[PDB]
Paper text:
Transient receptor potential vanilloid (TRPV) channels are a group of six polymodal cation channels subdivided into two subgroups by their sequence identity and functional properties. TRPV1–TRPV4 comprise the first subgroup of non-selective Ca2+ channels, TRPV5 and TRPV6 constitute the second subgroup of Ca2+ selective channels. TRPV channels are blocked by ruthenium red (RR), a universal pore blocker for a wide array of cation channels. Here we use cryo-electron microscopy to reveal the molecular details of RR block in TRPV2 and TRPV5, members of the two TRPV subfamilies.
We also prepared cryo-EM grids of TRPV2 in the presence of 1 mM RR without the activator. The dataset yielded a single stable state with unique and strong density at the SF: RR-bound TRPV2 (TRPV2RR) in C1 at 3.3 Å resolution with a wide SF and closed lower gate. The presence of RR stabilized the TRPV2RR SF in the TRPV2Apo2-like state but did not reveal the expected shape for the RR molecule. The TRPV2RR SF harbors a large asymmetric density coordinated by Glu609 and the Gly606 backbone carbonyls from only some of the TRPV2 monomers. TRPV2 has a flexible and adaptable SF which can easily allow for the entrance of the bulky RR while the channel is in the TRPV2Apo2 conformation with the open SF. Yet RR is not tightly coordinated in this position, resulting in somewhat amorphous density. Thus, our results agree with the previous observation that the TRPV1-TRPV3 SF is dynamic and can permit cation passage even when the pore is closed at the lower gate.
Residue numbers in the entry:
A (entry chain D): 31 to 45, 74 to 414, 429 to 524, 527 to 560, 590 to 612, 616 to 652, 655 to 693, 699 to 720
B (entry chain C): 31 to 45, 74 to 414, 429 to 525, 529 to 560, 590 to 612, 616 to 693, 699 to 720
C (entry chain B): 287 to 381
The structure:
């Protein structure tokens, strides 16, 4: 729907010097043909930025047309055009003019000049009063599915995302209008946030992003030395490290976490090396915004806010791996105390459901069951109230939080039905019992032997498709068999066919015996074909020579980050990790010490 | 058996200067022994092209043998032999002589000269009056499963297919008789068609074909600027782009679709870049004979006429992917309205079958059922009348049409029998009901999640393993029945089959041991056959095949769109042309289609 | 020297057939020489036209007409797991 930004074949829409003559002159690049434009503007009292000299739908001015038609990086009409604009006395300069269409809103000639990689044009524009903080905020420049190009929204951000060091240096160090590193787009994303967003985990793109991130950190150490760029938070409250954690950009996240500089750039480092002895290397890691002591940390963002498949690979990176290991070692006793409490509760549940001072003890057991159901209901509801989005964004590693809530709800319903003397309380009680015994498997993640999936992913994906196909088959054959016997009702026939399909029962077979037999044979063969299809489709993922340890570590990380908050009835005070050491200039940080042994890496440094 | 073209060991078939002496002389290459041949020919009143001086079967002349026996790229007897022929007063010169055998029909000395890669021989033959438009119509030069070499039929096409740029340049630019790029073989195939037909999807052959195609296009633009070579249609009615689409030549079809040139050859381009901004590139694609508005479009040829396994790889190329996506987005509502109508009809079917003032409602349901069956039968019959070829050439993606037709036929027959009050109407009705419920899975292709979600193998393994299993079943059934005489062949077959699929159980009487042995043997043999089933099906999975399910779904959507675009059989739908008319060079106005491409990986490869 | 038979009645070509030595077997079957050593060859090129190459293969001790030929030795006297790879060699395949 939006018109092309530039089209050699299609003329601009319209939604002496007319617009077409001027646009043809600036497109061909000859400046001598511009004579008479200024006189015409003076005579008609017009201005070069009026709607009569712009594209109707967007607002593309003549200058932007000139920049879009650069030849060898230069266009001879730009400087005379700006001179004509200045001589015309235009109250709003032709430079800094921007589009108004929703797709290209905010787009200016400086963005075109930077994108075309013409440093000369950038110099010419900035000299003539180009604003270097103009924001291109149209739909084309926003991050979404479809045709778009997100680079931030500032000229400095566009130059950074396009790998232009000369243009970035000029913009930062020009005297006419210096660009600001701490400038933000409409979303509050600075140049570092823009670099994080444009990054994908491919090696070359990661190398480019890392290179320009480090270069911009050094440039922000040179200029404005009193400003800490990495601490700037966008409108979502995310620093570049936290934004990388949320977006699942593992490469830049790892680089930022383990960033180490030598020489003058030491304060920019986050990893400090303490001592080495052969293959043993000991380093300090900065826990700024990483420790879960603070609200909305990197650990919490990775556990509960990230949704990328790279999520489990981030928790094994240092210092996250060692930090989470220390937390798990600290809280391993609380985990198994919870396991023992649940085991005792389930034992009482089993005894009470089985046996329906004996009578008084049974009543006491029922009271204890109701109290446990009430407690678990309150705990699960609070968990959902706190982490509603985590359930939706990753069901594959959070369904136990739903099963516990369902078990508590069923227990409460069974008890209240028993109070109302209803006879439908036994089914709810037995479902509660079986669901609790199933949920007992949650605590198998506490030890490695049972804690350490592939079929769980495919079933949660293909369940709906396979159910749709098999239910279409089942309904068709059930109605076909029921209609021919006039197998009492549709539900009974469907139950019979399903029980035969899963091998629980035989098939019943009255004239038209041959047709009933043919229908049953067709059903059996079709279901065998469908099950074989399912088996092979599940098989194709296993044989790919494909990380269970990382998933188990992520599970332990989630369990630890949930256990740190304490119970709902008792908030637990958190402890800062590491110690407040001085690393430079009083540059005091909450560093964390990690010892690492690597024979293979050390043996390569030997002659 | 056709005789060898030039055998150093086998003498030419028959079937002073005799033929054998002349053939020996021209094979040696020394022209001195040719002296006296003209005098003998004049005295005996004979020409070099007569029947006795040629191979009996093919009609190969001494000139062809001289060209066949080129040494170091030249044969010194060529010019003396031609001089003797022209001095003999031959009314039909030896240069234009051609073979007569059905295998080598149309073969000439110029063809041999071009094949031998001897430019000197080609120049010498052309200078002496060789016709550069002779067509080799023999079976050796046609394309068929066997010993054949198809290069078109013209010398220019032979030179183009053999990567001889000098020969092509001379043939098109010689003053004696300039070759024409518009010339066509027996099938109507020009040089571009011949290049398309010899194309193989291997990278080397594709590169050779692309290079020669571009070179010939540019050289034709230079020599014949008033004509368009890509618009010439053969006897099948296909342009080179459409010929590549039909035959499955993907790697040249893509190149033709996305051809782009800058400079003097821009009018030959089909992709025109409008603007670029970072990783975003926007280009105009020429929809000439690509859009389904025209008859025999590229889309229709790929969907319904192509039989190559590369069908689904072709509908994912630009601009075909974007064009089909836009067509689907325009016709997505019509698809689901059809789904809703079919669902309502099937619901009425289920109600009527289940319920076999209430009587009036049942009669209304019956007549609605008959009308629905009639509508589907007419709709499917028209589809087959239009696409008789598509069902046969590809069953894996057209069996749902057959199922719909069968459901309609069964519904109509069931209603007819119900009117006739035949007792067999109910089985037909229930079979129609179950078949129509199974046909409801056609519409899953509308939405991607289940649309993307063995079928190829079942036409490749079942037709063999059912033969083996039926041999086993019949043998053991007759063995059991004859020993028990289980009371009939069909009874034993049914019991054994039901046990095999696990549905039934076997029942064991004199010779109980032999019966038990037979049953054990049958069970073990069937278990081995089922293991072979499972292993054969498994090996196709560990083969590490690519994820082409997405492309197959796109091709299914393309077929559904191209059939929905014609409208219903009772109401022809007006065609909507895609793209807009734009000027792209010189009065050269084309119907271009705008496609926008975002590619970070490609763009980053251009940065320093 | 090719026609000398050992105590088992096998020429070097037949011995290579029996023992399953596929590489030397193919080389002996498809032996081609130019110039002075042409008579020692077993394969002769007749004519070539583009991709089509036509050649003559010597059928001495290979055709089943002779008793104890290469074909019979491969079919019934060889025990190597390479037998099915030998029947697809020229001129055995077309014969
Ligand atoms: C009558 C007792 C009333 C409760 C008083 C508090 C006792 C301590 C509570 C406790 O340890 O709870 C453990 C557990 C927590 O749920 P989870 O995080 O394992 O679950 C979340 C997993 N996603 O919760 C349970 O296992 C609930 C069981 C409640 C009854 C315990 C009977 C024995 C008490 C000594
Ligand atoms: C008796 C109807 C008289 C004509 C009235 C017009 C009704 C519209 C028909 C229609 O859109 O077709 C629906 C469907 C065709 O499936 P398909 O060709 O897409 O599938 C092609 C598969 N290869 O065909 C059917 O579902 C057949 C039954 C149509 C009537 C259903 C009752 C509801 C009408 C509103």
């Amino acid at each position: 729907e939006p018109p092309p930004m530039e089209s050699p074949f299609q003329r601009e829409d319209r939604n002496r010097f007319d617009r077409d003559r001027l646009f043809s002159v600036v497109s061909r690049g000859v400046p001598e043909e511009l004579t008479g434009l200024l006189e015409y503007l003076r005579w008609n009292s017009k201005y070069l930025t009026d709607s009569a000299y712009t594209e109707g739908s967007t607002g593309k001015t003549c200058l932007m047309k000139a920049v879009l038609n650069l030849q060898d990086g230069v266009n001879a009409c730009i400087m005379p055009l700006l001179q004509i604009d200045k001589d015309s006395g235009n109250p709003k300069l032709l430079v800094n003019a921007q589009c108004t269409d929703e797709f290209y809103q905010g787009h200016s000639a400086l963005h075109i000049a930077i994108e075309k990689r013409s440093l000369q044009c950038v110099k010419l524009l900035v000299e003539n009063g180009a604003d270097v903080h103009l924001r291109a905020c149209g739909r084309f420049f926003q991050k979404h599915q479809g045709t778009c190009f997100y680079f931030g929204e500032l000229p400095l951000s566009l130059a950074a995302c396009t790998k232009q060091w000369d243009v970035v240096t000029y913009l930062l160090e020009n005297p006419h209008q210096p660009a600001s590193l701490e400038a933000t787009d409409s979303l509050g994303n600075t140049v570092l946030h823009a670099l994080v967003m444009i990054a994908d985990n491919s090696p070359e793109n990661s190398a480019l992003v890392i290179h320009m991130y480090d270069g911009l950190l050094q440039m922000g150490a040179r200029l404005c030395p009193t400003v800490q760029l990495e601490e700037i938070s966008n409108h979502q409250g995310l620093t570049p490290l936290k934004l990388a954690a949320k977006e699942g950009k593992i490469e830049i996240f790892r680089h930022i976490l383990q960033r180490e500089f030598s020489g003058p750039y030491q304060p920019l480092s986050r990893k400090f090396t303490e001592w080495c002895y052969g293959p043993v290397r000991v380093s300090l890691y900065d826990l700024s915004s990483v420790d879960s002591w603070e609200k909305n940390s990197v650990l919490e963002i990775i556990a509960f806010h990230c949704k990328s498949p790279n999520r489990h690979r981030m928790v094994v990176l240092e210092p996250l791996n060692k930090l989470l290991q220390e937390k798990w070692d600290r809280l391993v006793s609380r985990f198994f105390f919870n396991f023992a409490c649940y085991l005792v509760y389930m034992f009482i549940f089993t005894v009470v459901a089985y046996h329906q001072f004996g009578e008084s003890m049974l009543l006491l057991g029922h009271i204890l069951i109701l109290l446990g159901g009430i407690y678990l209901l309150l705990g699960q509801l609070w968990y959902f109230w706190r982490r509603r989005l985590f359930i939706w964004i990753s069901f594959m590693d959070s369904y136990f939080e739903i099963l516990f809530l369902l078990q508590a709800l069923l227990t409460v319903l069974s008890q209240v039905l028993r109070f109302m003397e209803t006879e439908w309380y036994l089914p709810l009680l037995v479902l509660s019992l079986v669901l609790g015994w199933l949920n007992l498997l949650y605590y198998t993640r506490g030890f490695q032997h049972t804690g350490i999936v592939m079929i769980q992913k495919v079933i949660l994906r293909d369940l709906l498709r396979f159910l749709l196909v098999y239910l279409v088959f089942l309904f068709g054959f059930a109605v076909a068999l029921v209609s021919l016997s006039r197998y009492r009702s549709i539900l009974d026939a469907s139950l019979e066919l399903f029980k035969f399909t899963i091998g629980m029962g035989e098939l019943a077979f009255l004239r038209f015996r041959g047709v009933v037999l043919l229908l049953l044979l067709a059903y059996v063969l079709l279901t065998y074909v469908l099950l074989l299809n399912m088996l092979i489709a599940l098989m194709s993922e296993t044989v790919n020579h494909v990380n269970s340890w990382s998933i188990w570590k992520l599970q332990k990380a989630i369990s630890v980050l949930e256990m740190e908050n304490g119970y709902w009835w008792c908030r637990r005070k958190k402890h800062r990790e590491g110690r407040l050491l001085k690393v430079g200039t009083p540059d005091e940080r909450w560093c964390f010490r990690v010892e690492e042994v690597n024979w293979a890496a050390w043996e390569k440094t030997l002659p």
